[PDB]
Amino acid sequence: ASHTTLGVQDISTTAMSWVQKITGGVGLIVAVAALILIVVLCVSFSRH
Amino acid sequence: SVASFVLLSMVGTAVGMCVCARRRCITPYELTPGATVPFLLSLLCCVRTTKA
């Protein structure tokens, strides 16, 4: 029986949500902090 | 094709307005004796924001 063929892509089912929850990262906040620091420095940082 | 070149034309006049706004914003500066825009070039970044 070869009809039921499953590739590497597969349904994590409920656990899909789990990884969807895991995918959340703190890169957004770290980028925000970098932007804030670089601007408050832009008072002295013009174009470098 | 004609739509393409005409849309190129509107975007060309748009960048024309960009440069016109640049010159118009720097002109009131025109290197004033005061030489200070702490709230305009530091913020609006119109032209040559390297200086001020």
UniProtKB/Swiss-Prot annotation, chain B:
Cell compartment(s), UniProt: Virion membrane; Host cell membrane
UniProt region (Interaction with the capsid protein), positions on chain: 20-24
Lipidation (S-palmitoyl cysteine): 25, 45-46
Disulfide bond sites: 25-46
Ranges of the Cytoplasmic topological domain: 18-52
PTM remark: Palmitoylated via thioester bonds. These palmitoylations may induce disruption of the C-terminus transmembrane. This would result in the reorientation of E2 C-terminus from lumenal to cytoplasmic side.
Domain of life: Viruses
Bilayer disposition of the protein: Single-pass type I membrane protein
Region (Transient transmembrane before p62-6K protein processing): 25-45
Membrane spanning residue stretches: 1-17
Summary of the function given for this chain in its UniProt record: Plays a role in viral attachment to target host cell, by binding to the cell receptor MXRA8. Synthesized as a p62 precursor which is processed by furin at the cell membrane just before virion budding, giving rise to E2-E1 heterodimer. The p62-E1 heterodimer is stable, whereas E2-E1 is unstable and dissociate at low pH. p62 is processed at the last step, presumably to avoid E1 fusion activation before its final export to cell surface.
Subunit note: Interacts with spike glycoprotein E1. Processing of the precursor of protein E3/E2 into E2 and E3 results in a heterodimer of the spike glycoproteins E2 and E1. Spike at virion surface are constituted of a trimer of E2-E1 heterodimers. Interacts with 6K protein. Interacts with host MXRA8; this interaction mediates virus entry. The interaction involves 2 adjacent E2-E1 heterodimers.
Record-given protein name: Spike glycoprotein E2
Residues of the full protein shown: 697 to 748 of 1248
